[model samples]
Target chain A: EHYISLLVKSIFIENMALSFFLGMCTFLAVSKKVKTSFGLGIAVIVVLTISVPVNNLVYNLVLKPDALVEGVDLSFLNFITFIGVIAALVQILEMILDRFFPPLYNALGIFLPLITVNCAIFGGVSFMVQRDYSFAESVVYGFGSGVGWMLAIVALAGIREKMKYSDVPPGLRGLGITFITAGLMALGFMSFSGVQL
Target chain B: MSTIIFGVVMFTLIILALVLVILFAKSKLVPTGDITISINGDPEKAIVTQPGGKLLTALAGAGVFVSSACGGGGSCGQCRVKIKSGGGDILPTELDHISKGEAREGERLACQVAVKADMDLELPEEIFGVKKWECTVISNDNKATFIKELKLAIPDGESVPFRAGGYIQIEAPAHHVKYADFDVPEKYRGDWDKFNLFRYESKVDEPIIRAYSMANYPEEFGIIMLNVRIATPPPNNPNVPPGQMSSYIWSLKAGDKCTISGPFGEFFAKDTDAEMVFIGGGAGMAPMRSHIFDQLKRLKSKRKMSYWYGARSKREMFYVEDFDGLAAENDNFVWHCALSDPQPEDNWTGYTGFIHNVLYENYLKDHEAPEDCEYYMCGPPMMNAAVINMLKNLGVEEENILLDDFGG
Candidate 1:
């Protein structure tokens, strides 16, 4: 019940992009078209779903206080090690897939590396650690947050595409107009925060 | 102290582990063997190439150079090849260059095509005819402001055969230079003061290849002349230096040996009876000049030919006497000039504006169905786009308009 509620709560009530504004850089850049947004969104899903659980293990098994050696607190290395693990894992995964499964490499290889820079992924990993999530809960929350970000980006891209024809003011023509639209889309998603999990 | 020391040690060990895993993965990913690229399904034309490289370079390595101007930038559209099979799906960038008919025939731009798998492609006969020649700079002189008139002559008793209006790709090998005693000539020092050209450094690590159109017709064919404009680096951007190839070329003294390849591009004079009109400015005058001479002198074309040239100022313009002779000598040929930023003392008497504006006001305004005439141009991007939009708006068919992508 807690895991299911956490999943629903993360997707709607605590949407990573719309609510927390995590990974606004990629959100702004990659959400220009639904075609590319979906690609980046799925990439976010893969990075978030995989990284948070792995970080959960590394945090518990190594980086946590007294986890490595007696009376030693290496918890400060969490941020660096988490990022290092994410990047290294994705890189090694890319090489494996590129050699054996070239088709999937073409689909996901480029965005896989770029996803490490997207703060939404790092945000997801840190949130699981902060919430003291179990491995199973981390996986669920990671997947849910990714879906929320994906939904937010895809929705914004569609709105922006339609607003392409709108007579936006010359001053707020491109990025400015896009920012206003994103803010308005965030407001719409903010309505979902009212529902109980 | 121990806490900080242990943290770094553990981080290092973790990184070391990850690095090993990455190394192991890369070792597994190492390709087993090279791939075979069969051209036109012909065994004789087949090539063995390393996978995961660009098709253009793969073909070029096999001594089968597909024409490329932008150095694999895919902007030139000269390296188009038809891939019957094994070439991947056409990409979105290729959409601009590949026509519906071309896509139907499996044609793709070779510059952007990654030869990951064994590809079966078909090349044009003109590409097969291209020759790699070593030339020497017979004379390199300043023709206009920042524009060099370079004459490259082939080896003794050998002619690098090519039609007029085509271009050659010149190699600027990897060079490093820090200008120590570099002082611009007193005349050009003022203009050179705009950039740090005197304080410039070309610490380039890789060779650059660039396309330059012939500034002269190939009637005699021993020497190829080029109008190469030294490109300036953008202001407020310290990350980029001046054009490396342009700098290398602009520094060429007489008798400098240069390796060059081909007379590529479809910009040559067509065998047609239609009225021909040429509009160009800046270094773009190269192709147009070649085209004009090739039409009138080499082919003896008697079609009504009109050429429009635009320059920023009178002091920066060239070929005034040559065009004057051309117009006076040929009854069927006419010449027009426009000066955009003529000096106060220029005593300007010609149609004054940008070339596109002058053309519209002077000629196309009262012209009978402007679409009937064939137009060719090689100009700066803004000028090219303006002329293209102007022509397209006036009902000019795509085939009726030819352009040289060598941006001035």
Candidate 2:
């Protein structure tokens, strides 16, 4: 039940896109089409859910202060190992699918490349470490934030698609209107920041 | 002593684990170094090389130079060769240089071929591939009232690869007289409920083949995607009946076995860096969707591009968010959407005329090089016809504009 609240809160309140502003570039980039955005969002969710929990496991085992040698802290390797872990995970994920799930492997070729560098994925792990979230909570946060980002993007994509019908003046047409729309969405999500279970 | 040992141990383990994973990925994904490249017609012409690199470099290593203007860097449009078989998927690097017809016939940049697997080639400057694929319907999603996006996947090994701006022929199985050929999911039935299909009887002459343009880029060469609009007869008019192919498509949804053939259609972006203008509407979105994303996402192209999409009302429009996201992210890319007819309740705020009006007002009038721009359009016949007329009036060269007319 607590996990549920965390999931809900992560989705609405601490959204990786709207609230935290993680991976804003891609958030804007792929959000143009609801389908594309939906695909990207799902990819993001998968990365976060997997990587965050793995990072949590890594943190608990070796990286946490005093956890490895009882006094010799290796927390400084956080940035290096986390990034390496992410890249490694993505590569292995690609390999695993290509060998075992050939059909799925082909479909994700476009998306897998995109995920390797996404900030939201890295951002999710960072949040977990900073917040001291346990492995379970980290998993919830990863997926929840993924959902949050996906929803925000899909909503924006849906809005932007519809915005074509409205009068979006020339100067503010493409990105200009996008920012305004995202900002308004952020403001809406801002309301959720106050609620903490 | 323990501290130093601990630091060294942990770092080594981390680095080793990362290295092992990365190495494993490479070994699996990349074709082994020792491979053979053979010509299709000439069995005698063969090049055996340890090519763990790009095809261009591999060919050079094999003592067969495939010409070079840009020195095998993918920039010089000079190096194109045909891989008759095992070419895999089209790379973004070749998108600008490979024309639609060329891509259909197995043309690819020599620089882009990653000497993977044993490949058969066609010279001249020749190259090629296509096949009949068995696919499982991954999903059939509704985009508009009439349009449903169907996704099918080749269950096993790579069958054939086609670039975007092409289409596959779906063998829409006939509704057998004895029993229903397909069972539509309960959730998907809402849209079908409105169509008096049973009144008209969604029947097929046989298992007929209808060509639907590839609605997405070759994300996976094994994936066959199409955007289909139910070709309904006019209101109160029963003589025409409904479209047999689309009616069959509507009957099937997910997890259904289907057969489709080839990457047909000679629609592809020309190999040029000129500003691109894409105008499309209705079911014609398939090729445009494939081409635009192929350029933007896959190629990471920074070229200037614009898109114009129009619909009868707001109801028929799709992929708005996708293009909108594209327009925002790629500063070089922008798009316009228009509606020919807007009802009061619709509250439409975009252009209120034919698609050409949107391009003329929002794009063409302001473009410095309207003459230099390469225009690609797909849509209802009149839509492209009107845009062509407008381009002609503006003195834009005839060859500068290309069109895929989806007969209304």
Candidate 3:
């Protein structure tokens, strides 16, 4: 049942772009090319897969002054220290991808810098830490959020590519239409809020 | 004390780690001679060569200029480059600028083109002369009477060489360097020659170079002269105390240089055998003057010339005598000055009314088509657009006329 919830949540509930509006910069940037979009999606999955667990471990141990004790101090360090961990993880992930998969690096090459500012990454870790979700749960949430972001962008990109010649008005060109499309997508993603995850 | 020390130590450690990672990544990402660019055609027709790691970076490094007018933020479509043979499909960021016609023409924005493998391409001729310069506004000659003139100076070896009528982008400056783009040469970043002239390591601030055509003739001069009308109206302007460009620019003197880059734009009069009819008002003289001087210096066989100058009044018009001298010396050349609103006090009885109106009534009225003649016009935006419409109506093909307008 927990596994089912995880699976459902990954596909639905807290979506990266639709629900939180995170990872928007790259969502709009790389959504045009199908091949490049695939490369970025895979890269994002790998980053979240490794970083989330590592972050959970740090939070339970070093980040939390007393994991076993009730209300042990280090809560103030939550904002500053967690962001540091996120920054470092992104850099390491960037290097590893550049070394192993040159093609992936090229596809999402410059966008790697944007990952530092991507709230989905920061939000995923912060929510896990704040909620103190179990190790398995944290991994699931991380995987779920990443899958959510990837799915949203690929879907949006497909529709946008079709809308290339849709006889849209001049004033609502580019991001103007994108905002309207995204609003509709957010509404669609909201249908999942009713289903418990 | 403990908290401050800990924070400092943590920051130092993190920064050190980041630096090490960057150094390592730079070595790996940019392996030597990793990029290859291919240009289609004979050496002249097309060429593509990437000197750096990625297609975008190599294009930037090799001086194969592409207009990333939004500073390569991937928003502006001015820097569109096509990937004919080896490059990947267009990125999503380029959807704004890519029209159906452009896609049909094999166009891809260079900013979005990532150099994954050896790529071949065909580029426009304008990209060949593209160079980024780090320039300084060596001397600003802002004479109060008419338009302001800025004498720009790039690094000794990196000046953009071209005759009058070429312009450069002057960027709005970033907060760190100067609060505004008002007085820095670093502002111009559109042309390759611009970045080359004004780029300095310390200044991370971006300057937007608003394009201004050169008024000085390249053959006769040592430095570039720009005829700029400072259009900032006064009293309402907070920064500009006087509120006018003349007062603001006129305040500056010699040895105070600002960064400027580029000699961009392709609307010059080439020395041709076709007879020339020059029509201009105000700074329209920049292009027209260059045309007349070039023709005078490089007089082709059987080339007849004529000019129609327009102004509100006699005092408002300058360069009548100079143009009259050119007409006197050259039998094939003719000059006509038309005053649109000549005051009653002066006994000014010449071709009256607007230059376009005068031309339509007399000279061009008889001529069936001005297609054979190469027409050049530079002035206010409204005038140029309206003139283009009028010219089109008067049996002149759009291709035959070379037109440009400054912010005026």
Candidate 4:
């Protein structure tokens, strides 16, 4: 019951991109096309879910005191260590995706490589440290954040498609209008903040 | 100091581990094997090459040059090869580059295709002989405001024998030739700035190929003359750059060395004793000039020939003296130049309106539509479509009408 509540709360109520404003770069750039957005969303979900727990393990083992050197405080290496783990995981995932699923590999294209730099993965790891999440909770949080991000981007892509036919003002067309749409969508997602998981 | 060392070592180990894993994945994931590439259904022309490389690079290594404008980036779809077998499913890049009909016909962009295994490929026979020839710019004559007559000489004393109407592909390597490095006429400064011709600040990493028909017939001088017209994007298309190769060619000096490949295309005049009609516009005069000189002067043929050339004004129409001289000397030869939009200051006294209209008014009225005559046309898409349609309406047979569709 606690795990389900955490998953649902992370996914809907406390959405990463809509509520916390994580990973705005890919959310804005890739959300113009649904097909590309969907592929990138899936890639991010898989990377986040796998990377968060792996990063947690490294944090508890190597960077944690008494694991590396006796009484050494390596907690300061959290940021760099987390980034390294994410980048390595993204690279390995790229190879696996290319070999096993070529269609998804090609569809993800440049976005798959760009996932290493996605701030949402870093933000999720930071949240895990702040919340003092267990191994299982970190994995669930990663997956839920990815789902939240996916939902936000897919919705934005569909809205952008509809906006194409709309007679938008000259000054507020394209990226200008897209920013406004994101803000309004973010405001609407605030309604979910008070919902009970 | 010890803490810094530990941090450095940890980071280094992480990077090294990632590198090792990636290297192992790359080697193991991509399947590798020795493969045979059969060319044009001929087992004798088959070459053995290692798989896991791009088909374009593999064939290039095997001494076969498939023309690609965007190098191997797959943007221009010029390097299309028909893969009969061993090419797995069509890729997204190939799908983006080719049409549905082309995909259905087993055609794939060579750059996007991986040479995975033994593959049967079909390509034009002329591609086999396309060699990169080192050339020196011997002459650069201003034929018109936009047209430049360039003559390239093979420095190695090797002769390149090609059909009269065939064209050669010039390689445009990514270069930055500032405006001050090359001389630009003052009149063309506005157009040049609007089209950004003199500005070569673009970062084009891949080499591109642009085709130009040989203006003079292949002779023993080891020289190829081409009439290259500087092409600009339309005024409405403000984002597109002007012809990259044309600008590059125009920026060259007399002693400049260039690498080119070809004798590509099959648009030469056929060997028949038939009356010939050649219609040309813009730089389309290149191939037509080749056909005319070869037919009248070189072959000394008894067949009568008529050439109709068009331009917007008198200044745009060049090579008038040469054709007039040819017409004066040869009783069987006739040349006509028509200015479509002649200015009053030009005092142009020639057949007004389009070249095809002049052909209809002068040639069709005076001479009967010869049953044995063949029609050759080279022009922009609109002019070519109009002229071909006009010819077809005049009962000219489909086989008799041939066009050099180079731009297409």
Candidate 5:
């Protein structure tokens, strides 16, 4: 019961882009087109599912209070170590996607490398530390956040497509109008905050 | 102390394992070498090249330079060529820039196309004539407050055949050094500081190519003269990064080797005996200058030529003496200059207000038949729009006006 509630909370009640304002760079840039946004969203979901649990395991085994080294807490090296792991994992994913899923790769391959630096991935991993989530909970949280971000982008992309026909004002065109729409969407997502997780 | 050392060893081992895995994956995934690129139109045009690089760089290495304004970033759709065969499923990046019709015709952005194996491509015949030139910057003279004239000399001193208003694409190598590593040259420090040139986080490790119009007519000197304007961020948009290409060009000094791809663009003087009028502003002087010289020297046309140029002040205006000399030497040629915002110390100017207004008042107004004069205009978008409207209002036919608003 608690696990299901946590997933729902992470996905909607505490959405990454809308609630936390994380990964806004790629969200705003790539959300102009629905197809590209859809491709990138799937890539993010897949990456988060794999990386979160891996990061959690590494953290628990190496960097936590009861780490392998008896008196040494290597939490100080968490950020750099996380980055190295993320980069390495992304590289491996790129190879696999390029080899087996060429079409999917062609759609999202350019953005795969970019995910290494995306704060959303780091933000998810760090949240795991803050919440003291076990490996299973971390994976669930990561998957939920990925889906939440993907949903926000897909919705925004759909709105932007329709916006092409709408007669936008001279001053509030392009990014101006985009920001307004994003704010409204964020407000709508805020309604989910009342959900009893 | 023992525990700390052990932690370090563990972290190092993890990092080493990660690196080894990555290296192994890369070696297995990315295949290299022995790729054939065949130009389908002509049977003789084929090159054996290595695989895994972009088609733009691969073809560029084989002496085939594809016209790309965004430097192979897939932003500019100008580098499209038809693929006869071996072209894989179209990527989304290509789809963004290419149209449905173009996609149906097998047209793909060369920059976006990766050369993994033998591929047959059909390019415009003009691309075959495009030559990669290794030129040295002989001179960099400031033409105006923002405009700089570069005189590039090919080593062997051979004249290249190129149209007057054609542009050349030059590659700017990636300056991968950190910002704090070095300071800009003293001469360029002011300009550098104004743009706030820094190590931008999004800077790429690959070279980018940008196009600039030729400012000189093809002649025996083998020197390609170009006018480059240091692009400033838009008014009220201070957060925007400075023009990457313009900043790179400005940083170059004399004797520096600059890699450029051939004189591209269909912009040139119409083969007509009609009177010609040239309208220009800002960095528009590049193509306009080329056209003027091409008319005077190459064609030696007896057609009456009139030129009207606009600037903010005396310091902003350039080539005034040269135009005056040309006007004096040729009875058929005439020139006019207008200052939109002249300084008080600039001393009494000949004409004031926008050059387009001056052109209309002096020449277009009260003209019975303005269609006889063929108009060639190059300038900023606002200036171009105003002059185009003014010309249309003066009964100039759409076909009579030649506009090159930077690939508009």
Candidate 6:
């Protein structure tokens, strides 16, 4: 229950997309329909889940003063190195996914390319580094946050699909309504406040 | 000390790596034999050949002027272009601006799209004639409506094509000019020589372009009158000196020529049999007068016209006689001048109160059939938007309403 609680806390309670609404770029773009959004959302989940642990190791071992061969300082390359590593991993994941799960790859086609700019992926890993969470804790947090973003956006896509049939004001129809819906979602998510993992 | 040095070195490396990645990405994106595509029907003018530059930069290189309200941060949708072909895919950054129809039609923000190779493009027909002119502010006269009639003349035959009711970019020199201000350059670059007020203005500077509608006709030989009201200092503005270059040009009189370019914007008169309705305020008088004069010279068949002009007081009004003469010569044309604040001493009696209110009370009754009438409007965006809403209220579709001006 404690482990479940931690997962729920990371994924749902302190969700990036549903509550904080970060990484909305891919969230809005790839979340036009269920199948595509799921694929891209899962890509973020997998990429982030793996990437954050590697990043944590890199941060702890290579980046730390004592871990370096001469105790050399490579901390200056933190952002650049981190993003480079993340991008490289995403590329490898792309190739593997295409070989093994081509249907999922096809559904996630263009959006997979877009994960390079997804702030939520970076932000999730960044939170792990900031909070200095343990290896298991970081993985659970990263995966949970990715799922949280996916759920929020997937729900949004469903509502937006139905909203197509409803009448909307000329000015407030598209992004305006999306923002309002997100706001309402955020208000709902706020209910889990102080329920920390 | 170690913690701080480590932190600093890490930041430096991150920056270096970021720059290298950017350089690599840019080089790969614009490789030789990469297909250059022009989205929208924007002629072959939209592709930039330079490897490290932006797609919008290429369009500007080809004499295309795009309006970037947030200054190229991609926050505003003003630089939106329909990507007819050749951009590989939609970017995540462009999600909010893209609509279902836009995604279907492949519309992309020009700033966000990378120019790789040969591109075939098409945009709104009006953007074709748009050109940026690096103009020197020759003169500004506050005598009427804080109006400034810049006497900028493009090179002998290198003028951009524009009818009345059009605007152009009067670019201020970018960083190069600013750097040149302290470490001034000596040589003139391109057609930008004419806009140089001082010796340093002609370098490879990124000058800002202020959009001003063409107040005169093409026959005026590239002479443009931009009626800019003196801008009030923003509350947040740190006290800065007024632009000396523009002030010098504004002080000059006859026979003085400042460097000017352009005939940009798509807000010109469309050919039609429908009655034309022109509504404007302040410098809005410029385009309406030009159209009237142009029509008077050629007198095209089957087009009836009416012009409604608004001003605050009697002294602020100009070109009344011109419109009156137009009314005299053209039986099909009607001119209405309304003053918002009529003075007791001036004995104002023609028409009074707000122009929109006056139009609603009177003109809208007769011109209810604006569907057949082409409407040309130029004013502050607030007034223009309100008037457009009023027109729509009377059942004028956005198509029949011909205008493409920008925010003040």
Which candidate should be chosen as best, given DockQ against the real structure? 1
Instruction: Give all candidates' CA lDDT scores.
Output: 0.80, 0.75, 0.64, 0.79, 0.80, 0.65
Candidate 6 interface RMSD to the true structure = 6.6
- TM-score for each predicted model, relative to the true structure: 0.70, 0.48, 0.61, 0.67, 0.58, 0.59
Worst 10 residues of 4 chain B by lDDT: B197-206
Q: Identify the candidate with maximal TM-score.
A: 1
Cα error, residue A51 of model 2, in Å, equals 1.3
> What is the DockQ for all candidates, taken in turn?
0.59, 0.31, 0.16, 0.32, 0.43, 0.13
TM-score of chain B of each: 0.80, 0.64, 0.64, 0.76, 0.75, 0.67
Per-residue CA lDDT of model 5 for A77-185, tens digit only, reads 7887787888888879988777888776777776788797787888888888777898778888989889988998899999999888899899888778889899999
RMSD of each: 6.8, 27.5, 10.3, 7.8, 10.4, 10.7
- Give interface RMSD for all predictions: 1.2, 2.2, 4.2, 1.9, 1.6, 6.6
Label model 2 with its docking quality class: acceptable
lDDT of 5 by residue, B279-365 (tens): 987788877777887788787777888889889887778888888887777779788889998877689548989898987888878
Error of 4 at B69 (Å): 5.4
Task: Give residue B215's lDDT in candidate 3 (0 to 100).
Answer: 63
Q: For model 1, what is the error of residue B331's alpha carbon versus the real structure, in angstroms, after optimal superposition?
A: 8.2
- The digit string of per-residue lDDT tens for model 3 on B13-125 reads 65576568767876775545555566554354433454433456666565555555456656656666666776666665776779778876888777666665566777766
Question: Candidate 1 vs candidate 6: which has greater DockQ?
Answer: 1
> Candidate 1 lDDT, tens digit per residue, B1-408?
888888888889998998898887777785658889887677888889666778878878889776777676667576778788877778777878888889889889888988777667776666677778888889877776677788988898477567888778898878876543332455555556665566666666888788777876777668888888877566676557767877777777788898888867667777889999998877888888788877778888889988888787776677888888888888798877888998786788867778888878878989987788988877888888888998888878988788875554
Candidates sorted on DockQ, descending:
1, 5, 4, 2, 3, 6
Docking class of 5: acceptable
Global lDDT of model 1: 0.80
Could you give candidate 4's per-residue lDDT for residues B46-106 as a string of tens digits? 8888767788888778777777656676776777788878777787777787889999888
